[PDB]
Design an enzyme around this catalytic site. Structure first.
Site, PDB file in Angstrom:
ATOM      1  N   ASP B  10       0.829  -1.196   0.000  1.00 59.48           N
ATOM      2  CA  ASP B  10       0.000   0.000   0.000  1.00 59.48           C
ATOM      3  C   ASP B  10       0.877   1.266   0.000  1.00 59.48           C
ATOM      4  O   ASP B  10       2.001   1.304   0.572  1.00 59.48           O
ATOM      5  CB  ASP B  10      -0.946  -0.027   1.223  1.00 59.48           C
ATOM      6  CG  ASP B  10      -2.041   1.068   1.189  1.00 59.48           C
ATOM      7  OD1 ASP B  10      -2.407   1.544   0.088  1.00 59.48           O
ATOM      8  OD2 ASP B  10      -2.565   1.430   2.286  1.00 59.48           O
ATOM      9  N   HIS B  27       2.148   3.727  -9.861  1.00 61.95           N
ATOM     10  CA  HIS B  27       2.009   2.316 -10.245  1.00 61.95           C
ATOM     11  C   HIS B  27       3.342   1.781 -10.781  1.00 61.95           C
ATOM     12  O   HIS B  27       3.777   0.672 -10.453  1.00 61.95           O
ATOM     13  CB  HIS B  27       0.944   2.152 -11.316  1.00 61.95           C
ATOM     14  CG  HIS B  27      -0.437   2.479 -10.849  1.00 61.95           C
ATOM     15  ND1 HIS B  27      -1.469   2.762 -11.721  1.00 61.95           N
ATOM     16  CD2 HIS B  27      -0.963   2.552  -9.602  1.00 61.95           C
ATOM     17  CE1 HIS B  27      -2.570   2.997 -11.030  1.00 61.95           C
ATOM     18  NE2 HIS B  27      -2.289   2.875  -9.741  1.00 61.95           N
ATOM     19  N   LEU B 111      11.511 -20.182  -4.753  1.00 63.36           N
ATOM     20  CA  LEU B 111      10.450 -19.377  -4.158  1.00 63.36           C
ATOM     21  C   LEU B 111       9.081 -19.620  -4.803  1.00 63.36           C
ATOM     22  O   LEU B 111       8.972 -19.707  -6.041  1.00 63.36           O
ATOM     23  CB  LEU B 111      10.784 -17.908  -4.354  1.00 63.36           C
ATOM     24  CG  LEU B 111       9.697 -16.927  -3.924  1.00 63.36           C
ATOM     25  CD1 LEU B 111       9.610 -16.938  -2.365  1.00 63.36           C
ATOM     26  CD2 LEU B 111      10.029 -15.539  -4.404  1.00 63.36           C
TER      27      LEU B 111
HETATM   28  O1  LIG Z   1      -0.992   1.629  -3.415  1.00 61.27           O
HETATM   29  P1  LIG Z   1      -2.286   2.471  -3.873  1.00 61.27           P
HETATM   30  O2  LIG Z   1      -3.542   1.895  -3.045  1.00 61.27           O
HETATM   31  O3  LIG Z   1      -2.100   3.925  -3.674  1.00 61.27           O
HETATM   32  C1  LIG Z   1      -2.598   2.041  -5.662  1.00 61.27           C
HETATM   33  O4  LIG Z   1      -1.411   2.237  -6.436  1.00 61.27           O
HETATM   34  C2  LIG Z   1      -3.057   0.586  -5.784  1.00 61.27           C
HETATM   35  C3  LIG Z   1      -1.891  -0.391  -5.616  1.00 61.27           C
HETATM   36  C4  LIG Z   1      -1.593  -0.948  -4.377  1.00 61.27           C
HETATM   37  C5  LIG Z   1      -0.548  -1.859  -4.260  1.00 61.27           C
HETATM   38  C6  LIG Z   1       0.199  -2.220  -5.376  1.00 61.27           C
HETATM   39  C7  LIG Z   1      -0.106  -1.670  -6.615  1.00 61.27           C
HETATM   40  C8  LIG Z   1       0.475  -2.167  -7.775  1.00 61.27           C
HETATM   41  C9  LIG Z   1      -0.026  -1.680  -8.976  1.00 61.27           C
HETATM   42  C10 LIG Z   1       0.205  -2.379 -10.155  1.00 61.27           C
HETATM   43  C11 LIG Z   1       0.939  -3.557 -10.107  1.00 61.27           C
HETATM   44  C12 LIG Z   1       1.466  -4.036  -8.912  1.00 61.27           C
HETATM   45  N1  LIG Z   1       1.955  -5.274  -8.886  1.00 61.27           N
HETATM   46  S1  LIG Z   1       1.800  -6.154 -10.251  1.00 61.27           S
HETATM   47  O5  LIG Z   1       0.353  -6.527 -10.385  1.00 61.27           O
HETATM   48  O6  LIG Z   1       2.215  -5.314 -11.422  1.00 61.27           O
HETATM   49  C13 LIG Z   1       2.735  -7.632 -10.279  1.00 61.27           C
HETATM   50  C14 LIG Z   1       4.070  -7.583  -9.896  1.00 61.27           C
HETATM   51  C15 LIG Z   1       4.927  -8.623 -10.235  1.00 61.27           C
HETATM   52  C16 LIG Z   1       4.454  -9.716 -10.956  1.00 61.27           C
HETATM   53  C17 LIG Z   1       5.332 -10.718 -11.345  1.00 61.27           C
HETATM   54  C18 LIG Z   1       4.868 -11.784 -12.109  1.00 61.27           C
HETATM   55  C19 LIG Z   1       3.529 -11.842 -12.478  1.00 61.27           C
HETATM   56  C20 LIG Z   1       2.651 -10.839 -12.083  1.00 61.27           C
HETATM   57  C21 LIG Z   1       3.116  -9.773 -11.322  1.00 61.27           C
HETATM   58  C22 LIG Z   1       2.257  -8.736 -10.976  1.00 61.27           C
HETATM   59  C23 LIG Z   1       1.245  -3.325  -7.738  1.00 61.27           C
HETATM   60  C24 LIG Z   1      -1.143  -0.750  -6.729  1.00 61.27           C
HETATM   61  P2  LIG Z   1      -3.925   3.150  -6.356  1.00 61.27           P
HETATM   62  O7  LIG Z   1      -3.987   3.107  -7.832  1.00 61.27           O
HETATM   63  O8  LIG Z   1      -5.306   2.689  -5.668  1.00 61.27           O
HETATM   64  O9  LIG Z   1      -3.595   4.627  -5.812  1.00 61.27           O
END
Ligand SMILES: O=P(O)(O)C(O)(Cc1cccc(-c2cccc(NS(=O)(=O)c3ccc4ccccc4c3)c2)c1)P(=O)(O)O
Ligand SMILES: O=P(O)(O)C(O)(Cc1cccc(-c2cccc(NS(=O)(=O)c3ccc4ccccc4c3)c2)c1)P(=O)(O)O
Ligand SMILES: O=P(O)(O)C(O)(Cc1cccc(-c2cccc(NS(=O)(=O)c3ccc4ccccc4c3)c2)c1)P(=O)(O)O
Lengths: 208, 213
Positions: B10, B27, B111
């Site tokens: 978060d 993001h 992992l």
């Molecule tokens: O942190 P926030 O609540 O402010 C928000 O960024 C929402 C958010 C919370 C936590 C993480 C993310 C985030 C956004 C987009 C992607 C990711 N992770 S991911 O889905 O790209 C992911 C990472 C590695 C991976 C490796 C292999 C397969 C899939 C994977 C997916 C994390 C976004 P928001 O858009 O609601 O403001």
């Protein structure tokens, strides 16, 4: 009310350590712990909290019910009491009936309680309904299972306090804390007083 | 000895604003922080890493794009990938990609990385309950045969080491209906550090918090 907190749950821990630091034996920490419980119950009642749920964590109620009733507190015992002897259970239910009509603080005390068991006994109830040709496995959703866990008639747990320094739930409530604020303090239970409880309530108020 | 770490990621958006940039920038930095946490987990003997993205079609194609571009590397790094959550209504092409990505890495022995996608702790328990309700309805299960151990065999990740530590970044002190059944005994670690900033040093601090405690 002001703090916005309707239901507080506390994992009480630290009496043993507290007595040991004093150089006293466990029994002394137990007497101090019970004093701290009365203090927390008074505090909750005087501060508009609707429900207080207490859990005595161990790294290992007949006199009270009257003072409770006299303070307009409603008492419930959550946990697996299905194995206790039938005397206790009646004694338990009497204490419960006796205060069901009080309008002040609703106090829940865990006795032989586990969050996993809580979820399981609720599952069993739905299973029973299944075996009766009334419920289709696919009709079971969150809401339904929610109506079957302990304390589903009370406001959701808003805040969970754990004193004593450990940062874990230790199988206290699980389903019920899906959205609760989690507050951990190093203060040992016997020393957890009104200003500590207020601090936890203000932490919750400013966090939400 | 920390074997399975779960993280409530978060803080990306809030991070964005502190930079005075748009959500898309956050993001972007969040994805970099994911790669770094996964790398770190794999380099340090952690058995399982479970990731949950907390938020207050596009993302559907993004999910497909992520799987398409990153699976090959997870595979080479001996990582086993699993998605946990209700993907029953994801479009069929994304469902197929998830299935193939899991199939492709199922036999890896390093992992295990669990990516929660439309996951909820209550849903998870209810999914298990529905399975048991079936066996019961069939007549192969008696209502009082159902117990903690049995229910546990029907919740996500029951084949993996138990969750030892749950980390939540971003400042909030809640589980937010992430893992519930599985965290009965886990150490809970909260940090105000925003997800994009969470690095190797922050990760180790949490691990130590676990060690000493
Ligand atoms: O942190 P926030 O609540 O402010 C928000 O960024 C929402 C958010 C919370 C936590 C993480 C993310 C985030 C956004 C987009 C992607 C990711 N992770 S991911 O889905 O790209 C992911 C990472 C590695 C991976 C490796 C292999 C397969 C899939 C994977 C997916 C994390 C976004 P928001 O858009 O609601 O403001
Ligand atoms: O704090 P600890 O873990 O060191 C220990 O004091 C156990 C303990 C933890 C927390 C609070 C208390 C305590 C002592 C006495 C009374 C109270 N609360 S109580 O009167 O509602 C009560 C006490 C014990 C109970 C045990 C089982 C079910 C219900 C109980 C209610 C709390 C004791 P210990 O016995 O393990 O040393
Ligand atoms: O006693 P009062 O009404 O004068 C006051 O303490 C407010 C108050 C309101 C409600 C309850 C109480 C009260 C005082 C002292 C003890 C109790 N409850 S208790 O701590 O003895 C207790 C309750 C349930 C238990 C169940 C099982 C084992 C032990 C238990 C102990 C309640 C006090 P006050 O702040 O207005 O002076």
């Amino acid at each position: 009310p002001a703090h916005g907190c309707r239901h507080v749950a506390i994992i009480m821990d630290g009496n043993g350590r507290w007595a040991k630091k004093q150089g006293k034996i466990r029994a002394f920490g137990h007497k101090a712990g019970a004093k701290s419980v009365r203090r927390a119950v008074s505090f909750a009642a005087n501060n508009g909290i609707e429900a207080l749920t207490l859990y005595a964590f161990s790294s290992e109620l007949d006199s009270e019910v009257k003072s409770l009733h006299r303070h307009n507190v409603r008492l419930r015992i959550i946990g697996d009491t299905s194995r206790f002897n039938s005397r206790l259970q009646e004694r338990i239910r009497k204490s419960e009936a006796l205060t069901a009509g009080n309008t002040g603080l609703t106090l829940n005390i865990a006795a032989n309680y586990g969050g996993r068991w809580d979820i399981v006994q609720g599952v069993r109830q739905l299973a029973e309904k299944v075996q009766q040709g009334n419920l289709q496995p696919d009709q079971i959703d969150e809401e339904m299972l929610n109506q079957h866990v302990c304390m589903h008639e009370l406001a959701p747990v808003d805040l969970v306090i754990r004193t004593g320094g450990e940062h874990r739930i230790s199988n206290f409530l699980l389903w019920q804390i899906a959205y609760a604020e989690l507050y951990f303090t190093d203060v040992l239970w016997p020393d957890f007083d009104e200003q500590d409880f207020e601090g936890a309530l203000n932490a919750f108020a400013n966090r939400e």
